[PDB]
Scaffold this motif. Structure first.
Motif, PDB file in Angstrom:
ATOM      1  N   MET B  21       0.825  -1.203   0.000  1.00 27.75           N
ATOM      2  CA  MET B  21       0.000   0.000   0.000  1.00 27.75           C
ATOM      3  C   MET B  21       0.861   1.255   0.000  1.00 27.75           C
ATOM      4  O   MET B  21       0.575   2.213  -0.727  1.00 27.75           O
ATOM      5  CB  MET B  21      -0.931  -0.002   1.212  1.00 27.75           C
ATOM      6  N   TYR B  24       2.389   1.787  -3.285  1.00 28.99           N
ATOM      7  CA  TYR B  24       1.339   2.127  -4.236  1.00 28.99           C
ATOM      8  C   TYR B  24       0.993   3.608  -4.174  1.00 28.99           C
ATOM      9  O   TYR B  24       0.790   4.247  -5.213  1.00 28.99           O
ATOM     10  CB  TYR B  24       0.101   1.277  -3.959  1.00 28.99           C
ATOM     11  N   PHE B  25       0.920   4.169  -2.970  1.00 29.42           N
ATOM     12  CA  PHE B  25       0.484   5.542  -2.767  1.00 29.42           C
ATOM     13  C   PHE B  25       1.644   6.507  -2.569  1.00 29.42           C
ATOM     14  O   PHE B  25       1.422   7.642  -2.136  1.00 29.42           O
ATOM     15  CB  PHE B  25      -0.459   5.615  -1.566  1.00 29.42           C
ATOM     16  N   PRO B  27       3.657   8.375  -4.599  1.00 28.76           N
ATOM     17  CA  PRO B  27       3.574   9.716  -5.204  1.00 28.76           C
ATOM     18  C   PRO B  27       2.536  10.610  -4.552  1.00 28.76           C
ATOM     19  O   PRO B  27       2.822  11.784  -4.273  1.00 28.76           O
ATOM     20  CB  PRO B  27       3.228   9.414  -6.669  1.00 28.76           C
ATOM     21  N   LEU B  28       1.337  10.085  -4.292  1.00 22.77           N
ATOM     22  CA  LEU B  28       0.322  10.881  -3.611  1.00 22.77           C
ATOM     23  C   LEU B  28       0.776  11.265  -2.213  1.00 22.77           C
ATOM     24  O   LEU B  28       0.572  12.403  -1.779  1.00 22.77           O
ATOM     25  CB  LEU B  28      -0.999  10.122  -3.535  1.00 22.77           C
ATOM     26  N   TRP B  31       3.354  14.094  -2.521  1.00 23.07           N
ATOM     27  CA  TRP B  31       2.737  15.349  -2.934  1.00 23.07           C
ATOM     28  C   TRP B  31       1.904  15.943  -1.811  1.00 23.07           C
ATOM     29  O   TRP B  31       1.901  17.161  -1.601  1.00 23.07           O
ATOM     30  CB  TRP B  31       1.870  15.137  -4.172  1.00 23.07           C
ATOM     31  N   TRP B  45      -5.398  15.483  15.421  1.00 28.40           N
ATOM     32  CA  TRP B  45      -6.556  16.239  15.895  1.00 28.40           C
ATOM     33  C   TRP B  45      -6.295  16.686  17.326  1.00 28.40           C
ATOM     34  O   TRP B  45      -6.885  16.160  18.276  1.00 28.40           O
ATOM     35  CB  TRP B  45      -7.823  15.389  15.800  1.00 28.40           C
ATOM     36  N   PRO B  46      -5.407  17.658  17.521  1.00 25.67           N
ATOM     37  CA  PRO B  46      -5.073  18.061  18.888  1.00 25.67           C
ATOM     38  C   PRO B  46      -6.056  19.068  19.457  1.00 25.67           C
ATOM     39  O   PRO B  46      -5.660  20.048  20.091  1.00 25.67           O
ATOM     40  CB  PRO B  46      -3.674  18.669  18.740  1.00 25.67           C
ATOM     41  N   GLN B  47      -7.342  18.833  19.225  1.00 21.34           N
ATOM     42  CA  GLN B  47      -8.424  19.509  19.931  1.00 21.34           C
ATOM     43  C   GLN B  47      -9.549  18.507  20.149  1.00 21.34           C
ATOM     44  O   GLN B  47     -10.725  18.796  19.930  1.00 21.34           O
ATOM     45  CB  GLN B  47      -8.901  20.747  19.177  1.00 21.34           C
ATOM     46  N   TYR B  48      -9.175  17.305  20.597  1.00 19.44           N
ATOM     47  CA  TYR B  48     -10.053  16.141  20.513  1.00 19.44           C
ATOM     48  C   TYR B  48     -11.411  16.376  21.160  1.00 19.44           C
ATOM     49  O   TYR B  48     -12.410  15.787  20.734  1.00 19.44           O
ATOM     50  CB  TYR B  48      -9.336  14.931  21.125  1.00 19.44           C
ATOM     51  N   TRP B  50     -13.724  18.434  20.822  1.00 19.44           N
ATOM     52  CA  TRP B  50     -14.398  19.419  19.987  1.00 19.44           C
ATOM     53  C   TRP B  50     -15.613  18.792  19.323  1.00 19.44           C
ATOM     54  O   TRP B  50     -15.564  17.645  18.866  1.00 19.44           O
ATOM     55  CB  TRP B  50     -13.453  19.978  18.921  1.00 19.44           C
TER      56      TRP B  50
END
Ligand SMILES: *[C@@H]1O[C@H](CO)[C@@H](O[C@@H]2O[C@H](CO)[C@@H](O)[C@H](O)[C@H]2NC(C)=O)[C@H](O)[C@H]1NC(C)=O
Ligand SMILES: *[C@@H]1O[C@H](CO)[C@@H](O)[C@H](O)[C@H]1NC(C)=O
Ligand SMILES: *[C@@H]1O[C@H](CO)[C@@H](O)[C@H](O)[C@H]1NC(C)=O
Lengths: 522, 53, 65
Positions: B21, B24-25, B27-28, B31, B45-48, B50
C-alpha cells in the motif's frame, strides 16, 4: 552479607532522606543525589551477585523468597547513561511539580498544598473554583508533559531488562496475583451500585445549589465542583449535601480548639489508643526526636509524603503536619498505624521488611482510624455525640463517612488503570490526555469543566503520577480495610450495627492482628 | 491448506505486508506531505474535545 | 492526472481501512464483556475519535445505539 550491608546502607539512605525533608537546601540535595548513586551501585552489585544464583533448584522458602525478591535490579538494570538520564528525569519532574505554583499575574501567588487545596475546599464560587482548577492543571500538566514520555520509555526499558513486560507486570507483581486485574474489575463492579446511588444524590445536591446552567440532572458532574483539586474524595465538606440538618449532629471543628489540642498531645492520644488496643507501644524517643508541628521558617517539607522508617530498629519518625483539623486526626491515626506496621516486623530480615502487600500498609494504618471515627469513640474522647441513640445522627455520620472511602474507590482504580494502559503501549503519546478523561467519564462520573485539548497533560496534576508510585495500592486498602474492621468487630463479642461498632481495649482483636501482620512479606 | 501457503503462492512471502500500500500511494503521499507543509498545517486532531455544536 | 486519480482511489480505499479496523474492534470488545450495556455508544464514539478521527455532529446520548 546482604542483610548486614543493606541495614547500614539503607539507614544512611533514610537519614539523608530525613535531612532533605526537614532541611531542604542545596547541601541536602547534593547529599541525597550522591547517596542515591551509591545505593544504586550497591543494589546493582548485589543483584548481579544474586543473578549467578538460582532460586528454583534451591530447596528452602525464606532464602528462596529473598533471592527471588533481590533478583530484579528495579531501576539499576539500565546502563550508566540510561540510568543517569532516568534518575535526572525523575528528579526534574519532582522538582518542577513540588515548586509548581499557579497564580494571577497581578502579583499575588499561591502554592498547592497550603492554600490552593484549601482555597477550593472552602470556596463555593463557580468562577474561582474553575480558575484554580484550570490554572493548576494547565501549569503542572504542561510542565510534566515535557518529560513524561521519556520517563515512560525509560521505565519500560528498566522493566524489560528486569524481566517483566513494559512496567505493568512489574508493578502488578508486588501482589503476587496472576489474576489481579480481573479480581479488581469484579470488585469495582460489585461496588458500582452504592457508588452510583451516592453519585446520583451528589448530582442532585449540586444541581440544587449551582442551578441548572452548570450542572443538570442528566449528565456527569464537572470534576472541579466537588471540593478537591482532583475529586478523589469529593465533598468531604458536606455542608451542601447534608441529608437533613439535625440538632445532635457533630461539629468536630471546635472540640479541638478550646482545649488547646496541640499536635503533640493528639499524637499522644493516638498512641494511647493504639496501646489500649493491645500492641507494643512506640519507643519514647519518637516524641523528643521527631517533628510533627509547623516550622519556624518558610521552608518545612515537600508538599506531601508519608511516614519514614530508617530500618535501623530505633527510628520510626513521622513527617506529616497539617495544623489542627478533624482530618488531621484521621491522617495522624493513618500514620500511627503505618509506623507501627513498620515497627512490628523489626525482628524479620530487612529484605522482607516491606509488608505483606502494599495495600495492607494503608489498610492497617486506616482500620484504627475507621474504628475511632465512630461517634461512640468520639463520645468517649472529648466530644458528646448521639452515638447510636438516634438513627438520624447515625445516617448523617454514615453519609459523612461514605463521602470518603467511597467515590475514592473509582479514582484509585482509574489512576492505575490509566497508568497500566499507558505503560504497556496501549496508549500512544498523541492522546495521552484523552484516555485519561475517557476513564474519568467511564469509571467515575466527572467531565472536563472546560474543553481540555491535547497539550494539557491533565494527569500531571496528581502527585502520584510523576513521583512514580503505584496508586492502586490505595484502592486495595480502601476495599480491604473494611473487610478488616468486620473481623476485628467480631472479637468485640457483638455485631449489631456494624456501621457504629468500635474497637477499644479489645485485647484479643489486637493479638489476632499482630499474629498475622508480624509475618510481613515472608 | 492454511492461509500462509496461499499467500506465498500469489506473492512469495507468507506474511501480511503493508508495504505494498505504501509503495502504491508513494507519489500521492509525497505530494500531499509537500502541500501540507506548504499550507502550514498540523497532522492529527489536537483539539479532541471538539464538537461543532 | 496521476495525482487526481491517486487522490480519488485514496479516498476510496484508505479512508475505509480505519473503519474496517474500527467496527470489528468495537464488536470484539463488546462480545468479551468489556463494554457491558450502560455505555454501548460512548465506547463506539471514543473508538471512532481514536482511530478514524470523527466526532458526533450532535451530542449522542446513551440510549441511541
Ligand atoms: C531455610 O528456611 C528456614 C525457615 O523455613 C530458615 O530457618 C531460620 O531462618 C532465619 C532467617 O530466615 C534464621 O534467623 C533462623 O536462625 C533460622 N532458624 C534456625 C533454627 O536456624 C533457614 O535459615 C533457611 N535456610 C538458610 C540456609 O538460610
Ligand atoms: C540545616 O541546614 C542549615 C543550613 O544553613 C545548617 O546550618 C544546619 O546545621 C542544618 N541542621 C542540622 C540539624 O544539621
Ligand atoms: C559505581 O561502580 C562503578 C563500577 O565500575 C564505578 O565506576 C563507579 O565510580 C561507582 N560509583 C560510585 C558513585 O561509587
Amino acid at each position: 552479607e546482604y542483610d548486614r550491608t543493606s541495614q547500614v546502607v539503607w539507614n544512611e539512605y533514610a537519614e539523608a532522606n530525613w535531612n532533605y525533608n526537614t532541611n531542604i537546601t542545596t547541601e541536602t540535595s547534593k547529599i541525597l543525589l550522591q547517596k542515591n548513586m551509591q545505593i544504586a551501585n550497591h543494589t546493582l552489585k548485589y543483584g548481579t551477585q544474586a543473578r549467578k544464583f538460582d532460586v528454583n533448584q534451591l530447596q528452602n522458602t525464606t532464602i528462596k523468597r529473598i533471592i527471588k525478591k533481590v533478583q530484579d535490579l528495579e531501576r539499576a538494570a539500565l546502563p550508566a547513561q540510561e540510568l543517569e538520564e532516568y534518575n535526572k528525569i525523575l528528579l526534574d519532574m519532582e522538582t518542577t511539580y513540588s515548586v509548581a505554583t499557579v497564580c494571577h499575574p497581578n502579583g499575588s501567588c499561591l502554592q498547592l498544598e497550603p492554600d490552593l487545596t484549601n482555597v477550593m475546599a472552602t470556596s463555593r464560587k463557580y468562577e474561582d473554583l474553575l480558575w484554580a482548577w484550570e490554572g493548576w492543571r494547565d501549569k503542572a500538566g504542561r510542565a510534566i508533559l515535557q518529560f513524561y514520555p521519556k520517563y515512560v520509555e525509560l521505565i519500560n526499558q528498566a522493566a524489560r531488562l528486569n524481566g517483566y513486560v513494559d512496567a505493568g507486570d512489574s508493578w502488578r507483581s508486588m501482589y503476587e496475583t496472576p489474576s489481579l486485574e480481573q479480581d479488581l474489575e469484579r470488585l469495582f463492579q460489585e461496588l458500582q451500585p452504592l457508588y452510583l446511588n451516592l453519585h446520583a444524590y451528589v448530582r442532585r445536591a449540586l444541581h440544587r445549589h449551582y442551578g441548572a446552567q452548570h450542572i443538570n440532572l442528566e449528565g456527569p458532574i464537572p470534576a472541579h465542583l466537588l471540593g478537591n483539586m482532583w475529586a478523589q474524595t469529593w465533598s468531604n465538606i458536606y455542608d451542601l449535601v447534608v441529608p437533613f440538618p439535625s440538632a445532635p449532629s457533630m461539629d468536630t471543628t471546635e472540640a479541638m480548639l478550646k482545649q488547646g489540642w496541640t499536635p503533640r498531645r493528639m499524637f499522644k492520644e493516638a498512641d494511647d489508643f493504639f496501646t489500649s488496643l493491645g500492641l507494643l507501644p512506640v519507643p519514647p524517643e519518637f516524641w523528643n526526636k521527631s517533628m510533627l508541628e509547623k516550622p519556624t521558617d518558610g521552608r518545612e517539607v515537600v508538599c506531601h509524603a508519608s511516614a519514614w522508617d530508617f530500618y535501623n530498629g530505633k527510628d520510626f519518625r513521622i513527617k506529616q503536619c497539617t495544623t489542627v483539623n478533624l482530618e488531621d486526626l484521621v491522617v495522624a491515626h493513618h500514620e500511627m498505624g503505618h509506623i507501627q506496621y513498620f515497627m512490628q516486623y523489626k525482628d524479620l530480615p530487612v529484605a522482607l521488611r516491606e509488608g505483606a502487600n502494599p495495600g495492607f500498609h494503608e489498610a492497617i494504618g486506616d482500620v484504627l482510624a475507621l474504628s475511632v471515627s465512630t461517634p461512640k469513640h468520639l463520645h468517649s474522647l472529648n466530644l458528646l455525640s448521639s452515638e447510636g441513640g438516634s438513627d438520624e445522627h447515625d445516617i448523617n455520620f454514615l453519609m459523612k463517612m461514605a463521602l470518603d472511602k467511597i467515590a475514592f474507590i473509582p479514582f484509585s482504580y482509574l489512576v492505575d488503570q490509566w497508568r497500566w494502559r499507558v505503560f504497556d503501549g496501549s496508549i500512544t503519546k498523541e492522546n495521552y490526555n484523552q484516555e485519561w478523561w475517557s476513564l474519568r467519564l467511564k469509571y467515575q462520573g466527572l467531565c472536563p469543566p472546560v474543553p481540555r485539548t491535547q497539550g494539557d497533560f491533565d494527569p500531571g496534576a496528581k502527585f502520584h503520577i510523576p513521583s512514580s508510585v503505584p496508586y492502586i495500592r490505595y484502592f486495595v486498602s480502601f476495599i480491604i480495610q473494611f473487610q478488616f474492621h468486620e473481623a476485628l468487630c467480631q472479637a468485640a463479642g457483638h455485631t449489631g450495627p456494624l456501621h457504629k461498632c468500635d474497637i477499644y481495649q479489645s485485647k484479643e482483636a489486637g493479638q489476632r492482628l499482630a499474629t498475622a501482620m508480624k509475618l510481613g512479606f515472608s | 491448506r492454511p492461509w500462509p501457503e496461499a499467500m506465498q503462492l500469489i506473492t512469495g512471502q507468507p506474511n501480511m505486508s503493508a508495504s505494498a500500500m505504501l509503495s502504491y500511494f508513494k507519489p500521492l503521499l509525497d505530494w500531499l506531505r509537500t502541500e501540507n507543509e506548504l499550507h502550514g498545517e498540523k497532522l492529527g486532531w489536537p483539539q479532541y474535545n471538539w464538537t461543532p455544536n
